[PDB]
Amino acid sequence: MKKTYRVTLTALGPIFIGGGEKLKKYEYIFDKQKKVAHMIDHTKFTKYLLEKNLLDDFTSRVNSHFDLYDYLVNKKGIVFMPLVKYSVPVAQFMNDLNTFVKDAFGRPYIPGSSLKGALRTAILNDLKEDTKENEVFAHLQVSDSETIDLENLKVYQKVDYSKTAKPLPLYRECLKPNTEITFTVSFDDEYLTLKKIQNALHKTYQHYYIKWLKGGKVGETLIKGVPSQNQGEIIYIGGGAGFVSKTLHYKSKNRDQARNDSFDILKQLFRTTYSKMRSVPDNVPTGKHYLEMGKARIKLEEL
Amino acid sequence: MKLVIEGTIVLKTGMHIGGSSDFSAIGAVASPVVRDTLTRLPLIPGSSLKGKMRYLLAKELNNGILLNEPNNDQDEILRLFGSSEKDKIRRARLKFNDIKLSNLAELETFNVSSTEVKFENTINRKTAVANPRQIERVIAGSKFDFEIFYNLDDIKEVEKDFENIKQGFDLLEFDYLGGHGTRGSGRIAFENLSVITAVGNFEKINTLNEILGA
Amino acid sequence: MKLVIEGTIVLKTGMHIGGSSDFSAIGAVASPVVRDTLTRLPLIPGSSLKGKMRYLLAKELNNGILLNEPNNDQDEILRLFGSSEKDKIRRARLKFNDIKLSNLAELETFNVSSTEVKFENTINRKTAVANPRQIERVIAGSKFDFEIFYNLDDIKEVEKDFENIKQGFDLLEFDYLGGHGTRGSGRIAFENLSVITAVGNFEKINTLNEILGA
């Protein structure tokens, strides 16, 4: 009977939704050596360059590709910088930034399709037979969030942790952790309820741990580490959380599913396949945390 | 003797509605939004608003379940929206209209365009290969000034009919308006509701703004 | 004398009228809009305007509701729109005309076709399966310069006749003109309204032009 619930998505790890906006080595990005990044708007940048020596400054910077690293801003007296939409901090340890999805007002939010995809991945831990006419997802009403303040965004380094952590040249503009994101979700009780959602998220997280990530934490594992079950109301929002987060087929044994997706992804591609996959954390500093990526905490409240 | 229900629909979320005959570029948006094709500036069809209002009223009246054909709704719904059964055709006392965007000047104050391309995909859960799409979605905080002509038939039912109309205004607050609304779109807010006469003067019209614009 | 009631009908919404008399494609419009077939310019039939105006005016007169045949209206409506009852037959004082689309150059100035396709659907209430339809519909802001001939037969009744005519136009401003009107189309308005003589001069022509020019 349209059981509306207020979902407060506590961002336990870095949450990234992307939205189709790639930021290149020096293309709208302004990264300085004080461990923060500023970013600019294309219109005011282009008219600020076309007001002063149009063909000259275009041919100078086009000559200076690819080595730019925003010190033409310093040498040319262009230290005058009104081109700050918002400032973002960078977590390092060569640049290609992916930014978070923002609405037309330039103030970020998580769209409701993302959260429905996450809960659909959490609910579908029955057999993978649920097609595009399943009646249970036509009665789940999830909205977007309110506009998150721009100070809760942080640029991270994507690190891979298979045997030992090594970085990959890919920055994505995630959320800083313990950040509360507020959704409003409603559904028909004839198909799913609070109990089904908490049990599905609990089941998905516990199989995610005991079939792949506890195996990460004990197998091919050393002291490079220096969280279950807490309640457990934990889901993975699509921040590059991994292959096994997005799929569902760690149902219903550890072995045959691992060799199945082993063949399936890493046979047809270039690198050689066998056990096991690689884990993707992020990192912040001098001691490091190696805090893991895509995870979040989910709370359900009556109205 | 008609009444005009002036109002304003305030967008909280995207509200992608409609099918266009626009040719879609392949690196661009597919299935764009419906527009008022003179300027082709964004449009809310009257048929969409009528369909959602009739659906949400026909759920709350006949409380809960709904599996019947639209001519077999309750008497309030048929006398408010119309009928096509052979014995008793009811001429609709409501008359919806296509609602064009009104606050484009308010949007040019904020210096944003009137609509936005939203990026979505679909992850096939077997091999985790995606399948992208773009949808053209109106921005939030856009107003839509509308007016619905109430055709007064008899004053014994006008109070009940505006109570049902405010009920359907309330019910559409908690449900989408059109398009991919189960996934976060179409959240509307009926703000600054009012009613007025066309010609002449309804003597009990001060009670009608109390049961509607409140 | 005869008088000519000159004016124009401006569209605020779609106004889909009519049925061809044309073949249909199997991915295109069903029920296309009616056209003047020599020029393939969209047309308002004079029958549609006369029927809607007669229904609205004989709904206002006979205060409340009308349920009778066209031959059983009051003498104002019978003398204004003709009659065919057996002995008390009355020739129509008004002669309507087929109204072609009149501002095609000002539609082409904004670089758009004279008509649009408006995508619709309906969902089955028990199976949620959609059922799309496409209706051709005239674009909003299309102007229709019309003219209606009036037959000045009794000079002491022309005041009440033009009072009734302005009443009928002012009612038809708050109602659709044809087709899918309750679902957001057909809303028109009347502009440039005046009356001129056919040949000669009518003595109180200013009292008719003032009662229409307000």
Place this chain on the structure above:
Amino acid sequence: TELKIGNEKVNSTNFGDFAEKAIRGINHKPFVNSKGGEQKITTSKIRGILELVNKVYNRVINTNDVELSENILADIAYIKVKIAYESGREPVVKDFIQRTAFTAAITDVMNQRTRESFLLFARYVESLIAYFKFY
């Protein structure tokens, strides 16, 4: 009146019969998808092709002139490009276009820039999908 496919002609008394023969060519010897399996084209792909044509058809049957305009024939060229692209998407669409010779018809329309040639092409596409759904 005239529209060539190969050395074999289709005209405006006749498009239903070549739509018969074209679809009955798609059946009885269907596409092979680089496997031992069978595969025929789905409804949504060919009817997206139909909606691609009918975005132009609604502005041609509404008009008067015996020669197509430049906006219309520009969108005809766009239809040919979209045919090439969604041919490049899937091989089953490529062999559907190659057997039910659609590029030949759309190039015939682009050569003879008359109104009735495109209307015949629209008849042929609608008849293709009619005999797809009939079987």
Place this chain on the structure above:
Amino acid sequence: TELKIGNEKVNSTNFGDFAEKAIRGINHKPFVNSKGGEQKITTSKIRGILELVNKVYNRVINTNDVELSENILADIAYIKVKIAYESGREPVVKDFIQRTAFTAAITDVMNQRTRESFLLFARYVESLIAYFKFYGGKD
């Protein structure tokens, strides 16, 4: 002057009788839509078929030559396309079209491309609609 349907030919002495036999054969053995109950074609679909015929019939009756012009035959072939389309959509339409044999009639109209053949077809369909309303009407 004599239209072929199956193994028995129909002309302007039998089309009312043939259409009466066809309609009264549609009753006493109706169509089943792969569920428990029977289902026959409704008024609106066969009025769609009759409207498709009448869109050419309104033009043919004001023509001169005994052989039809090419735009008439274009529209007849497109009627054949439309009937083949609408029958493939709903199987209750396919049953009515095959049993009250329509496609064979319109093909043999297209073979003998004469005016009298199309008039024979049009009066055949008109009689078919007439007898459908005559037997078991729901008005």
Place this chain on the structure above:
Amino acid sequence: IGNEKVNSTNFGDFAEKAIRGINHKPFVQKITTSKIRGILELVNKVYNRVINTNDVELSENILADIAYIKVKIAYESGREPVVKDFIQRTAFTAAITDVMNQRTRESFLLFARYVESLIAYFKFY
């Protein structure tokens, strides 16, 4: 509607000729399906804002957009030699400079349809 020898009609034919010229006697490693799509995505990101405008001329911000995608494809050409041969054998930068010296909306739609036809006919062969 001229726009440097390629009309509103023969844009796909020119792109088909260009891709067929690419396909036999190619550069050395042929061009992949990701950079050319990146070009497509940047030009259609400009195209969405362009086609939802109202008038038949271009704003200042739109000329900023075509100028900045010119310097973006200058950067991307400066990355790889194969995309240099791609943009050289195309009249791409010529089309951008003609959009600079023409500043008409229909020319931008023609160029967008040209690069869409480049994507399409690269995919077709």
Place this chain on the structure above:
RNA sequence: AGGAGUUGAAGCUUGGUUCAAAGAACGUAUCAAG
């Protein structure tokens, strides 16, 4: 130092409803009858 690859997929393309209603159906004049 970033490379590739998915750029939309599937479904419905109108459904049902009245499908010409009420009037006049020749009136007169020579002819004739008176």
